[PDB]
C-alpha cells in the first residue's frame, strides 16, 4: 500500500529560511520568512543577562529592541528596568515593594500571558532569565 | 540558494541539517546528494548511492551524535550514512520490514540516538544506534493497512511520544510504557476520509501542543491539546478544500507557522491569529 | 479636531514634567520605592505620548492598566500621598475608579 | 658561573658518568630559571637534558618525575586509555563537553583536541571551549557545580 | 523591616510566580544551540539550574584519580605539581595518557605553542600520545 510519490515539500531552518524543492528536472529554492517568526537570532547575539546589574540587563535589552524596531519588547524591557532600579544604600521599603504581589511579579505574570498569546518563546525565556538573574 | 536539476528524475525530500549548513536531497534515482549551502553557494559534495529503490525520506542526526544521516527507500532497507574525515560512508543496515519503509525521523537528542522507522505494511519500528552492540528494534503494529508518516514529540524538559499517521483514515498517538517496555496506544484521532499523508508535531509547546495531519481528501486538521493528558481539539485549516492532494506538513522551528505542500507544486504558509483563525501568511510556488 | 489632539499632547508633555519633578523630589529625600513608581509613570506617559505623536487583554505596560495597578498597590500598602497624587493627575484622562471613590479619597486627604 | 657549567655538563654526564657536582649544577640552574620565572627555558633545558641523556642503545638515563594522575570512569574503575567515545573496559559512555556536546575521544597540538579536566569538580570541556567560556565567566558550566576552575 | 533586612535577595521568587521557567528556558536553549551561540544556552541553563537548586548525567563518570605512590619525603608534595611551573595544580588541568603528568591549562596553552615533548622530559610526544 505504497502511496503516490510526492514531488514538492519544505524544510524550515533556524533563521526562518524556507527551503522548498519542486518537480516539473528538479528545482530547490530558498525563501526568507523571518518576518513571520517572532524569535530572532539578531537579538540573541546582543542580549545580555548576566554580566551587568539587574537594571543593566533590562536597559541593554531595551536598547537592543529599540535599535531593531521592536516597540512593545523595548517598552517591556524599559518598564522592567524601572522596576529593577537599585542603589548603593539599602532601604527596606524597596525590598518590601519588590516582594509585593502587585508589583514586578504581576508584571512578569501578565507579560508571560501576553507573550504566550503572541507565541514569543525568546521573550518568554528572556523574561524568565532576567527575573531569575535579578534575584541574586 | 537556487539549485537546478539536482537529480535527473523526480525529487522526494530535501532536509537541511541541524545548523542549516548542509542539505540532504534524496530522489527516485536511488541517489542522495549532500550540498554545502553556506551563504548562497550550493556546491555539491557527494553522490551517495546505496539504495536499490527510490529513496523517500532522509533525516540528519543531532551533532551530539556526529554527522549521521539516515535514509529510507522503497526496498525496505534503512541505510545510515556517517561522514568521517570528509569520507561519507554507510555504517549500519536496518532491513526489518517486509514492505517499503515510508517515514524515517530521528528522536530528540535527549532520548538517545533513536530512529523512528515507519513502513507501508502498517508496522513501525524504533531502533537505537549505539556503538557496535546494536539493539533489537521494538516493533508494534501501528495501523492495519499502512503507515505513511511518523514524527516525534519534542522533549520540553531535560514520557516519550510520537505521532503515527496511517493509511486507514486515522492518526494515532503512542506513549512509552516502562512496564511493558514498548509503546502503548495513548489516543486515537479520526478526522480524515483518506490516507493520512504527513503528521507533524510542533517543536515548541507554549500553552498548547500542536499537530498538523494532512491526507488525500484535500484537507488539513490542526489537533491541539491544552493539558499534558487531555482531549484533542479538532479544527480545520480552511473552510474550503485544497486544490490537490496534500503531501507534507512542516512546522516552523519557533513560532507555530505551518508549511503545507499540496499536489499543485505550491507551498502554502499558515500563521494563527490571536483569536485562533488560521490566516494564510505566504505562498511559495516553483 | 486637531485642537483636541494638540491639547492632549500638551497635557501629556507637562504631565511628564510633573512626573519628573515628583521623581526628583522623592530622590531628594532618598526613598527609592516611590521614585521607581514615578519613573514608571513617566515612562508610561512617554509611551502614550510617542503613540499619540506617531498616530485578548491589554499588555501590563499599557498606560491605564499600569497606572491603575500602581494605584491599587499604593492604596493596599497605605501610601496616601501617592494614590492621591495619581487621583489628581490621572483621573480624567485615565478612568481609574468611580468618581465617588476618587472624590472620597481627596476629601479624606 | 653555574649556567655554563650546567649547559656544558649536560652533554656528557648522565650519558656516561654519574657525579654529584653535575646534579648540583643542574638543580641550581633549574632553581635559578624558576626564580627568574623563566619556566619556558627550564622546560627547554629539561627536554635538552632528556635528549642528551640518550645512550647509543637509546635508553634514557635521566631522572624523570614519577607518574602522577590517571583517569577513571567509576563504572568499571579502570583507566580509560592504555599507555572510540566509550570506555574500553566496560563500554560506558564518556562525559560530553558542556558547550558543543561532543564526547571524549580515546585511541602541533591544536587547542580543540584535549579536555581540560578540573581536579575538583571532575567536569571536562575542550580547551578551546574552556578558554572561550572561562574568559567571560568564572563558574563551572555544568548544571549544578559551583567551582571556579579559572 | 526586619524581614527585609533578613533577605539577601532582591526578590523572593517562587515556583508559583514563574510556573514554566524550566520548559521555556530549555526550549530557548535548544533554539540557541541551533544558532551559532553555544555559550548562551549554557548560561541560561546555568541560571535555570541555579534557581532549581535554590528552591530545592551527561557530565559524570570520569573522576581524576591521583596515583597513590608510597613515598616518604618531598616527592609526596611533588606528585601534585605542574610540570611547567612546579606549582600545585587543583583546577583546570591537562592530562596525557601515555605519560601520567599534569599541566595547568595556562601552562599547557603556553607550552604547546613552543614545545613538542613533555616539559618534565620523559620523552613522551604528548600532542600525539595523550589519548
Ligand atoms: Zn569502564
Ligand atoms: Zn567541546
Ligand atoms: Zn564542575
Ligand atoms: Zn572545577
Ligand atoms: Zn603550571
Ligand atoms: Zn610526561
Ligand atoms: Zn605524555
UniProtKB/Swiss-Prot annotation, chain B:
Any additional notes?
Answer: Present with 21400 molecules/cell in log phase SD medium.
GN (gene name):
SEC13
Native species: Saccharomyces cerevisiae (strain ATCC 204508 / S288c)
Q: Which residues form the signal peptide?
A: none
Q: Which Pfam families match?
A: WD40 (PF00400)
Function description: Functions as a component of the nuclear pore complex (NPC) and the COPII coat. It is one of 5 proteins constituting the COPII coat, which is involved in anterograde (ER to Golgi) double-membrane transport vesicle formation. First the small GTPase SAR1, activated by and binding to the integral ER membrane protein SEC12, exchanges GDP for GTP and recruits the heterodimer SEC23/24, which in turn recruits the heterotetramer SEC13-SEC31. The polymerization of COPII coat complexes then causes physically the deformation (budding) of the membrane, leading to the creation of a transport vesicle.
Might you report a single GO cellular component term?
A: nuclear pore outer ring
Keywords attached to this entry: Cytoplasmic vesicle, Endoplasmic reticulum, ER-Golgi transport, Membrane, mRNA transport, Nuclear pore complex, Nucleus, Protein transport, Repeat, Translocation, Transport, Vacuole, WD repeat
Family membership, please give it: Belongs to the WD repeat SEC13 family.
What protein name applies here?
Protein transport protein SEC13
Q: Where are the transmembrane segments?
A: none
From Swiss-Prot, chain C:
Compartments it resides in: Vacuole membrane
Entry superkingdom:
Eukaryota
- Repeats (WD): which ranges? 8-48
Null phenotype?
Leads to short telomeres.
The similarity annotation says: Belongs to the WD repeat RTC1 family.
What further note is attached to this protein's record?
Answer: Present with 606 molecules/cell in log phase SD medium.
Q: How does this polypeptide assemble, per the annotation?
A: Component of the SEA complex composed of at least IML1/SEA1, RTC1/SEA2, MTC5/SEA3, NPR2, NPR3, SEA4, SEC13 and SEH1. Interacts with ribosomes.
**General function of this protein:** Component of the SEA complex which coats the vacuolar membrane and is involved in intracellular trafficking, autophagy, response to nitrogen starvation, and amino acid biogenesis. May be involved in a process influencing telomere capping.
Query: What's the protein called, per UniProt?
Result: Restriction of telomere capping protein 1
Q: Which organism is it from?
A: Saccharomyces cerevisiae (strain ATCC 204508 / S288c) (Baker's yeast)
> Which section of the whole protein is represented?
836 to 1207 of 1341
Swiss-Prot record, chain D:
Q: Which domain of life is it from?
A: Eukaryota
Protein location: Cytoplasm; Vacuole membrane
- Signal peptide stretch: none
- Could you give the subunit structure recorded for this chain? Component of the SEA complex composed of at least IML1/SEA1, RTC1/SEA2, MTC5/SEA3, NPR2, NPR3, SEA4, SEC13 and SEH1.
Function comment: Component of the SEA complex which coats the vacuolar membrane and is involved in intracellular trafficking, autophagy, response to nitrogen starvation, and amino acid biogenesis.
Q: What extra comment accompanies this record?
A: Present with 184 molecules/cell in log phase SD medium.
Homology family: Belongs to the WD repeat mio family.
Name-wise, this protein is SEH-associated protein 4
Q: Which residues of the full protein are shown?
A: 809 to 1037 of 1038
UniProtKB/Swiss-Prot annotation, chain E:
Q: Where are the transmembrane segments?
A: none
> Disulfide pairs?
none
Subcellular localization(s) per the UniProt record: Vacuole membrane
* Highest taxon, organism lineage: Eukaryota
Q: Tell me, how does this one assemble?
A: Component of the SEA complex composed of at least IML1/SEA1, RTC1/SEA2, MTC5/SEA3, NPR2, NPR3, SEA4, SEC13 and SEH1.
Q: What does this protein do?
A: Component of the SEA complex which coats the vacuolar membrane and is involved in intracellular trafficking, autophagy, response to nitrogen starvation, and amino acid biogenesis. May be involved in telomere capping.
Q: Which family does it belong to?
A: Belongs to the WD repeat WDR59 family.
**Note from the entry:** Present with 556 molecules/cell in log phase SD medium.
Q: This protein is called what?
A: Maintenance of telomere capping protein 5
Q: What is the originating organism of this protein?
A: Saccharomyces cerevisiae (strain ATCC 204508 / S288c) (Baker's yeast)
Coverage span on the entire protein: 1006 to 1147 of 1148
